[PDB]
Each structure stands twice: as C-alpha cells, then as structure tokens.
C-alpha cells in the first residue's frame, strides 16, 4: 500500500530499470548482437545505409560501384555511369560526359553498436579497383582504426561508436570493407573448437539491410530513431537510447 | 664519392632491389594478400573479370546467371534471356527465341596470385542449377585442380597461376566457385584458436571487384598492367611483374 | 554567359536560368520544377531530393580590363529575385568593385 | 523605468514604427525599387506570374507564344500548339486539332508597386503578331492606361496598383508589354546627363522572375504573402502590407 516513487516498494520502478538494464546487458553478452552500419552521403543530400547484424562478429564489404548512388525507379545515367567507372578504374579509360559523377559518395560514416570491442575494428579502405594499398604486393589487408572511433553518448552512456571521414577530393574513389568483433571479456574463445561451427553458422544467419533515404532528416526520423539505433549527425549531434541502470 | 653501378656503395641500387624484394616477400607472408580472378570470355570479345583479394584464403562463387554477359546501360534481351535460363535449367523448359545465347561464356580462366598454395586450390564447377556432379547425392563439393594450373612466368619468376578451360559446346552451361589458401610453410595454423576470429574477420574484409571490358586489349592495358597483376592471354603470352631480387 | 558591348555591359539571370541544363540529356525536368517551388518558399514543393545538384556551387564574375572597376554593380538577389529580403528595403545593387 | 505602451519612453514602439516607415519611404525614394507583375490566368486555374524589379523604371514585354500556359515537365501538345499559333497569326493558317487552345490566357492582371508614378504607366497590348494597333503604320506604340489602375489598399494605405482585364472571347489573342517609371516628385531628372549611365546600368541590373503556380491559392500563399507583395484576387480582395507610420 505504498505511494509511487517514495519507497523501495515501487516495483513498477524497479522492474522498469531492470527491463532496460537487461536489454543493455543482453546485447553485451555472448548471446547478443553486434551491429555495423555504413552511411554513404551523396551531394544531393541523400544517404545510403548498409547495416549488418550478427552474433560474434560482423562486417560489410562493398565495391566502388556498389557505393555509388542508385535511385530506385528513376533514371541513373546508367550508360554514362559505366563510362564513369571505366575512367575511375584507369585515368582516361572511359568516355563519360561528365567530369565528376554526383553519384560518388562525398563522405562515409561507420557506426558500430556499443557491443563491439573497439580494439577489434578493422577497415579495408581500398582504391576503386579494390586494392587496399596501391598494389596488392605491398598491401596489408586492413588497418585497425579503433583509436579513431568517437563515442556516441546519450546521458553519459556510450550508445555506439563512430568513424566519420569525408571524401571531398576528385581522387577519393574508394572500395570499402569494415569488420568488428563482439565484446568478449571472458577467457572463453567463441571460435575455439567447441563453438567454431556456431560462428560459421552466424555468418549464414547475419541479417543485412540496405536503403537510400532522401535526407538525413528522414534517416534520423524513420531509420535511426524508431529502431533505437545510435547515430551522429553532420551537426555533431548524438542520437541513441541509454539503457544501463535507467528508467 | 663512388660512381653509380661500379661498387657496393651504390645504395640507390641496393635499396631498389630491396624495395622490390620486400614487396615480393610481404605478399607471401602471413600478413599478405592472396588473390583470385575469374575471367569469363564472351563471343563478342568482351571479358567479365571478377576479383577478390583477402588475407589467409580467398574465393569467388557465381551462379550460371551471374556469369552471363551483361552490358551495363545497353539492351540485354532481358526477357528472352529469362526464357534462355529456363531452357538451360531443364531441356525444353523455356520459350526463348534463340538456339544459343551469345551471353554464355565461351571460356573461363582462373588466375591466382603467386601467394596462393597451389595444392590448396579447389574448384566447384557445377551444372546450370548449381550441382557439382549431376546430382547432389553423389557430389563431392569440389575438385582439387592445382595440378592443372600453369605457372605464369616473367623473367624466370612465377607471377601467378592459371587454369584455362574452354566452353565450346552447347552443353557447357556452368555455375562456378573457386577457392585457394595463402601459402603457409610455417607450423602456425592461421585458423587455430589463437587467430581463428581474424580469419572470420578476413571474410568480412575481403575486397571484391567486377567489371566487363570490351576487349582483351582493354583488359591487358587498363586492368592487368596498371595494377601489376598477372595474366595469360589467348595467345599464351604472360603478363606480370617479377620482383624477387630484381631492380 | 558572356556579353560584349560598347559603353556599358551587363548580364541578368533568374535562379532557374542559372541551374545546370544538360542539352539533349535528361534533366529531371518535372522534379526540378518541384525543386524550384521548394526553393521559392520553404516546403512549397514536392521534390524527390534534398539538394539539387543543378544548383551552382560557385560564381565567378569577370570583366574585361576596359571596364572601370568603380562602376561595377551587382544585384545578387534571393531565389524570387529580390535584392535584399524584401523589395521595400532593397537598394537595387551593391557596388562591389573593391572586391 | 516606464511601462510599455503608457508613455513617450516606449522606445521599442517608436523604433517599430520608424522601422516600418523607413521601409515605406525607402522604396519611394530615388534609391528604391519599382516593380511590375504580369499575371496570366489560365482556364485550368493556374497562374503564370512574371515579375521585374528595378531602379528608376521597369517593364515587361512578352510575345503571344510566351504568355501561353507551359507546364514544366509535363506534356504540352507542343506540335499541335505550333499549329495553334499558325492559326492564330493568320485565320485558317494552321492545321490544329482544336478550336480553342486552353493554353491561351483567360485574363491578365498588371500590378505595379506603390513606388510607381501611375501617370507614367504605359501599355502596348498588341495582336498575336505583336502589332499594337491593327497595322504598324497607324500604331501609336503604347497607351497611357494609368487612369484605369485601381488602388490596392490595406488599412487605408495604397500598397499597389492593379489593372485587370479579361480575355473571354476567341479573338482575344494578345502580345503584351507594360512599363512604369518610379515616382520622382523632385526636379532632379534621373535620366539627365549626370545620372543617365546609371539608368542604363539599371536596365542590366533589373531582376526578373517567372513561375507558374497551380492555383491562385498557391500564388497568394507562397508568392504574394511571403514576399509582402500587393495583390488583388478574383474575389476583389486586397493583399499587401501597410507600412507608413504603422507598427
Ligand atoms: N567499453 C565500454 N563499453 C560500454 N561502457 C563503457 C566502456 N568503457 C567505459 N564505459 C562506461 O561508460 C561511461 C562513460 O565512460 P567514458 O570513459 O567513455 O567517459 P569519459 O571519461 O567522460 O569520456 P572519454 O573517455 O570519452 O573522455 C562510464 O560510466 C563507464 O563505466
Ligand atoms: N611455390 C613457389 N612460389 C614461388 N616461387 C617458387 C615456387 N617454387 C619455386 N619457385 C622459384 O621460382 C623459380 C622457378 O622455378 P620452377 O621450378 O617453376 O622453374 P622450372 O623448373 O624452369 O619450370 P617448371 O617447374 O614449371 O618446369 C625458381 O627460381 C624457384 O626457386
Ligand atoms: N500617389 C500616392 N502614393 C502613396 N500614397 C498616397 C498617394 N496619394 C495619396 N496617398 C495617401 O494614401 C492615403 C489614401 O488616399 P486616397 O486618396 O487613395 O484615399 P481615398 O480618397 O479614400 O480613395 P480614392 O482616392 O481611391 O477615392 C491618404 O492618406 C494619402 O495621403
Ligand atoms: N558517354 C556516353 C556515351 C553515350 N551515351 C548514350 O546516351 C544515352 C543516355 O542514356 P543513359 O546514360 O543510360 O541515361 P538514362 O537512359 O537517362 O538513364 P538510365 O539508363 O539509368 O535510365 C545512352 O543510351 C547512351 O547510348 C551516354 O549516355 N554516355
Ligand atoms: N521468348 C520471348 C517471348 C516474348 N518476348 C517479348 O519481346 C520483347 C523483347 O524484349 P526483351 O527480350 O526484354 O529485349 P529488350 O527489351 O530489347 O532488352 P532489355 O529488356 O534488356 O532492355 C519483350 O518485352 C517480351 O515481351 C521476348 O523477347 N522473348
Ligand atoms: N516530385 C516528383 C513527382 C513526380 N515525378 C514523376 O516522375 C517522372 C520523372 O520524370 P522527370 O522528373 O521529368 O525526369 P526525366 O523524365 O528523367 O528527365 P527529363 O524530363 O528532363 O527528360 C515525371 O514524369 C513525373 O511525372 C517526379 O519526377 N518528381
Ligand atoms: N495538328 C497536329 C498534327 C499532327 N500531330 C501529331 O500528333 C503528335 C501529338 O504530339 P504533340 O502535339 O507534340 O503532343 P505531346 O507529344 O503529347 O506533347 P509534348 O510534345 O508537349 O510532349 C505529334 O507528334 C504530331 O506528329 C499533332 O499533334 N497535331
């Protein structure tokens, strides 16, 4: 017969806090998801998002061509854009009718879920023919870029990790792959013989999503926010939901 | 104060040789790339290339449909070619307006980087419905075809490995997957528990490339040569760059 | 755009006229009408894009060395061709020669 | 320490009134704009507006063809409408598939800013081949129509001047030019030798605007009102902002 918010017998309050805490902790458990998003920003203000969600580890790999703006059900200068690709793969190799394709991304943001271990993040940012570092012979196949990731924070809680980089120059023509491993502070190796086949199955079970939104507003409103995803906008504003020990 | 090319004090010469040797050896190290290319040759003289570059191991897998010629931004007889597929998947199963689709590859060449171990190469050359050997029940899922690979050589150095096969007959309608493992003469298993999650990450981090060139000339000039890739042309001519102990 | 004349010379263009037009190619003409409506008044259009890549990213004005730079005048208006927010408070030009 | 709206020490009030008065008076000064709009009303309810804003004097001149409805990015019966023009320029001179083109304006409204001197307004309302009065040989090139202009009033202030005329008959096929001169109650002639080159420059510097709105509602809401322009609607309702000595 106690009054709300006045004693330790407010079970609605306690259960609300536990409900949120359990979600925070489940995601961070070995049973939980790790997620990555790649955002490609185009000059027309639209944004391509690619997302993958999987247990244990997760990544995305795209070609130069795949990262170019594609407007579903509209004209895309498809023939001229084939010629653009040829001239990007080798200088003067194409016969395009344009100096700069507005379909090329102007910037990339990579975001991981807070369940990633940031020291496991690896990126292969290749040239337009998918070579990590000038020539295959001298290429390490990735860079460990975790130190560059900024914490996306809401109410003091890390809700995600962001690496943002611009591609403002004519020569910024890239292929891109990124990968991170789910946190595991235990000494149980999820890829040790006991569980390695489950990790192989996780590669099959990973769910992917891709869509082009017309505006960052639409991305924030209809993609980030409804799904309780983390995001950092072009104005450096953080989005996400803090859950640990919170009502 | 020594004269160029006349003593052991030609440091420009020594460093040039070391620079090239280091690239050769880095590629062959466990830190290095292994690469595969699949070339599909069409009757119009164009060539589809698919390339993947990754640490540890690498492969490509394509469907029958995926290997058919696609001309970006041009007509492709898309409806008739759906009917072609139906008649290829089962005899008399389609209603195509042609006896032979000129979109079917006439030949395939598989090339691996010299950092592959040739004894690890495996190929699954399936029928048009993606069965390795007539029926699933009697199929081994691959053949180890390394003994068939020819050494692509420049100046006495192996710059790559090639398996070329023609598809000259109406019945040569294939699905195709190929895989090789990076050399590892050490007794350190890159997939042992210590490193297995890095191999899982390598699957995410692998970069892919695909493009159709109008001619083998254009492939040699604008794809093989600029990237210091190995190649064997239809005239049996070898392309590539020898690097070990060379200026 | 170039004009050559004796005594004095100038050029005057609308917002629409300065947008990229690709002769003999597709130009998203309908969507670009909607772009214009949304540029003339906020939320006034129904365009399928946030930013039209047809909008100029920069302008350079060049005069021949036979101009008197102290006579140069520019009317850089908004998208509805008003020099300075509202007609009632607009001087119809700025003397920009010092720049 | 006085209370708002209770003394001569309400400086916010005084400055608000001066701010508005200054805008009213600046526009009417020789440094200010004079503006003209031509509205062409089509049977589908859409309205073409042409506006020009310039110092000293201002006008608009359009051909018969230019005043016809054009729907950007939609079909316009362009070939048939060429034939319509031929049959309008000379009776039975075309081969059109229609008796009356719905692209012809049904009415015209000319509006000047209140900074015009109404006695300077001149109109050349020509026939479809751009002759003011039947034949060039007997044409005065304009009519001084200022006496016909109605004052558009808001709160007792003239906010603009309107001349409205319908074109309800099949034979109302017009070319149209209008011109007015900015008020100048001084004895300083803005076109006297001292300033004549500035008037020549004003011809270059005049800004033009044209757009077709789908409805008079849209014109009122999104063109007239946001820009503090004067307007008189088909219901004889006046729009505009009174500024002289007003808060
Ligand atoms: N890897 C992690 N994952 C999730 N939460 C963490 C992690 N590391 C620390 N935290 C918790 O998140 C909160 C924020 O810690 P953090 O160190 O990020 O804050 P800070 O020191 O103010 O900012 P910064 O470290 O970026 O300068 C702390 O309450 C901490 O306990
Ligand atoms: N697996 C390998 N990878 C890279 N280089 C190798 C490999 N095996 C041998 N080599 C080196 O490459 C060079 C060529 O050796 P190879 O045995 O291919 O020549 P060959 O005997 O003339 O030709 P083949 O063996 O094809 O008849 C030698 O100098 C050798 O040391
Ligand atoms: N040419 C003008 N430009 C701007 N304001 C004017 C002009 N002539 C008069 N006014 C002012 O505008 C207000 C309206 O004057 P106006 O003579 O138009 O009113 P009215 O006599 O009620 O109407 P009308 O003259 O149309 O019958 C007056 O306060 C007057 O001082
Ligand atoms: N560098 C070149 C050379 C030729 N063309 C020709 O011009 C036409 C333009 O078409 P395309 O580039 O395909 O643009 P759209 O057809 O407008 O767009 P989409 O194909 O995406 O519908 C093509 O058919 C092609 O034959 C071209 O666009 N660019
Ligand atoms: N076996 C058949 C049966 C019918 N058609 C019809 O003929 C048309 C030919 O078009 P398609 O095969 O699609 O070739 P294109 O339109 O020229 O090429 P693309 O679709 O690649 O632009 C099709 O619309 C289809 O309705 C056909 O091509 N083949
Ligand atoms: N905001 C909107 C609403 C509708 N549409 C419709 O989608 C089609 C796209 O055509 P358009 O914008 O005119 O582009 P293109 O036809 O490709 O280019 P152009 O007209 O310059 O040849 C139009 O017919 C129009 O009916 C559109 O583009 N944009
Ligand atoms: N008096 C005539 C004679 C012939 N045609 C023919 O019929 C077609 C109708 O097209 P048009 O009048 O141009 O109308 P749309 O093509 O529908 O509109 P737009 O051209 O503005 O897209 C034309 O190609 C023209 O050859 C016509 O319209 N009117």
Which string of DSSP letters, residue by residue, matches B206-235?
-EEEEEEESSHHHHIIIIITTTT--EE-TT
Cβ neighbours of A48 in C, within 8 Å = none
| Dist CA D187 CA D148 (whole Å) | 27
Helix (H, G, I), strand (E, B) or coil at A24: helix
Helices B196-205, A196-205: inter-axial angle, 10-degree rounding: 20
Best CA proximity match to D226, nearest among D244, D236, D245, D213: D213
Contact B204 A86 (CB under 8 A): no
Angle at A70 between CA A68 and CA A74, to 5 degrees: 150
Interface test with A, best of B114, B204, B208 (most A CBs within 10 A): B204
**H/E segment holding residue D45:** none
Contact D23 C71 (CB under 8 A): no
Minimum Cα–Cα distance from D227: chain C residue: C86
Distances (CA, A) of D192 to B88, D181, D196, D197, D199: 88, 15, 6, 9, 10
Could you tell me where the DSSP H helices lie in chain B?
11-28, 64-67, 78-89, 196-205, 216-219
Inter-residue contact C82 to D210 (CB < 8 Å): no
For residue D193, what is the DSSP state?
T
Minimum Cα–Cα distance from D240: chain C residue: C88
Beta bridge partners of A128: none
Q: Name the residue at shortest CA distance from atom 18 of ligand 4.
A: A77
The length of chain B in residues reads: 247
For residue D224, what is the DSSP state?
I
Inter-residue contact D41 to D50 (CB < 8 Å): no
| Dist CA B208 CA B206 (whole Å) | 7
How many Å lie between the centroid of ligand 7 and the Cα of residue D78? 6
How many Å lie between the centroid of ligand 3 and the Cα of residue D116? 14
What resolution in Å is listed for this PDB structure? 1.6
How many Å lie between the centroid of ligand 3 and the Cα of residue D188? 24
Angle at A119 between CA A113 and CA A125, to 5 degrees: 80
What's the order of all strands across the beta sheet hosting B116-126? B57-62, B175-182, B116-126
Read out DSSP for D10-44? -HHHHHHHHHHHHHHHHHHSTTSEEEEEEEEE-TT
How many Å lie between the centroid of ligand 1 and the Cα of residue A206? 28
Best CA proximity match to B109, nearest among B243, B216, B225: B216
Q: Is the CB of A242 under 6 A from ligand 1?
A: no
Number of CB atoms found within 10 A of residue A25's CB: 12
Inter-residue contact D116 to D34 (CB < 8 Å): yes
| Dist CA C52 CA C31 (whole Å) | 9
In degrees and rounded to multiples of 5, residue A197 shows phi and psi of -65, -30
Cα B84 to its chain centre, rounded Å, is: 27
Structure tokens at D112: 């000047």
Contact A189 B202 (CB under 8 A): no
Helix (H, G, I), strand (E, B) or coil at A26: helix
What's the order of all strands across the beta sheet hosting A57-62? A57-62, A175-182, A116-126
Beta bridge partners of D211: D49
> For chain A, what is the domain count?
1
Inter-residue contact D205 to D150 (CB < 8 Å): no
Read out DSSP for A30-90? TTSEEEEEEEEE-TTS-EEEEEEEEESEEEEEE-HHHHS---TTS---HHHHHHHHHHHHS
Tokens 């009030």 sit at which residue?
D13
Inter-residue contact D39 to D229 (CB < 8 Å): no
Write the burial class of residue B127 (CB in 10 Å: 0-12 exposed, 13-18 middle, 19+ buried): middle
Tokens 């505006």 sit at which residue?
A215
| Dist CA B6 CA A93 (whole Å) | 42
The CA dihedral of C63, C67, C69, C72, to the nearest 10 degrees, is -70
Buried b (16+ CB within 10 A) or exposed e, C54-85: beeeeeeeeeeeeeeeeebbbbebbebbbbbe
- Strand positions, DSSP E, C1-99: none
Best CA proximity match to A160, nearest among A60, A14, A36, A42: A36
Beta bridge partners of A47: A41, A213
| Dist CA B48 CA B42 (whole Å) | 8
Q: Domain range spanning residue B78?
A: 1-247
Q: Tally DSSP H helices, then E strands, for chain D.
A: 5, 11
**H/E segment holding residue A66:** helix A64-67
| Dist CA B55 CA A142 (whole Å) | 9
The CA dihedral of A99, A101, A106, A108, to the nearest 10 degrees, is -130
Tokens 């007889």 sit at which residue?
B77
Tokens 């990754």 sit at which residue?
B54
**H/E segment holding residue A171:** none
Minimum Cα–Cα distance from B195: chain A residue: A191
Helix (H, G, I), strand (E, B) or coil at D165: strand
Q: Does residue A52 come out as left (phi exceeding 0), alpha (psi in the -120 to 50 range) or beta?
A: beta
Distances (CA, A) of B221 to A50, A86, B39, B215: 34, 12, 15, 10
Method: X-ray
Structure tokens at B155: 């100046």
| Dist CA C1 CA A94 (whole Å) | 29
Inter-residue contact B145 to B213 (CB < 8 Å): no
Number of CB atoms found within 10 A of residue B223's CB: 22
Distances (CA, A) of B173 to A40, B36, B127, B128, D203: 38, 22, 6, 5, 73
Read out DSSP for B124-144? EEE-TTS-SSSSGGG--S-B-
Beta bridge partners of D36: D52, D112
Inter-residue contact C80 to D209 (CB < 8 Å): yes
SS3 content of chain C, % helix, strand, coil (to 5): 20, 0, 75
| Dist CA B59 CA B221 (whole Å) | 25
Interface residue ranges in chain C relative to chain A, Cβ cutoff 8 Å: 25-26, 28, 48-53
Helix (H, G, I), strand (E, B) or coil at A3: coil
């Amino acid at each position: 017969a106690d009054v709300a918010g006045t004693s330790n017998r407010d079970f609605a309050g306690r259960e609300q806090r536990l409900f949120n805490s359990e979600q925070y902790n489940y995601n961070n458990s070995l049973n939980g998801e790790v997620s990555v998003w790649v955002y490609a920003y185009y000059s027309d203000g639209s944004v391509l998002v690619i997302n993958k969600n999987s247990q244990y580890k997760v990544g995305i790999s795209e070609t130069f061509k795949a990262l170019k703006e594609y407007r579903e059900g509209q004209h895309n200068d498809s023939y001229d854009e084939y010629e653009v690709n040829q001239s990007i793969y080798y200088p003067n190799g194409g016969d395009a009718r344009k100096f700069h394709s507005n379909a090329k991304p102007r910037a990339i943001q990579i975001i991981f879920s807070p369940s990633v271990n940031v020291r496991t993040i690896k990126m292969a940012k290749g040239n337009a023919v998918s070579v990590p570092d000038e020539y295959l012979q001298r290429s390490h196949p990735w860079e460990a870029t975790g130190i560059k990731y900024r914490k996306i924070k809401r109410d003091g809680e890390i809700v995600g990790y962001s690496h943002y980089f611009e591609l403002p120059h004519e020569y910024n023509s890239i292929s891109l792959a990124v990968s991170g491993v789910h946190k595991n502070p235990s000494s149980y190796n999820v890829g040790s013989a006991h569980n390695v086949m489950d990790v192989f199955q996780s590669c099959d079970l990973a769910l992917r999503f891709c869509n082009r939104y017309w505006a960052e507003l639409e991305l924030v409103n209809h993609y980030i926010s409804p799904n309780a995803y983390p995001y950092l906008d072009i104005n450096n504003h953080s989005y996400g939901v803090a859950l640990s020990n919170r009502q």
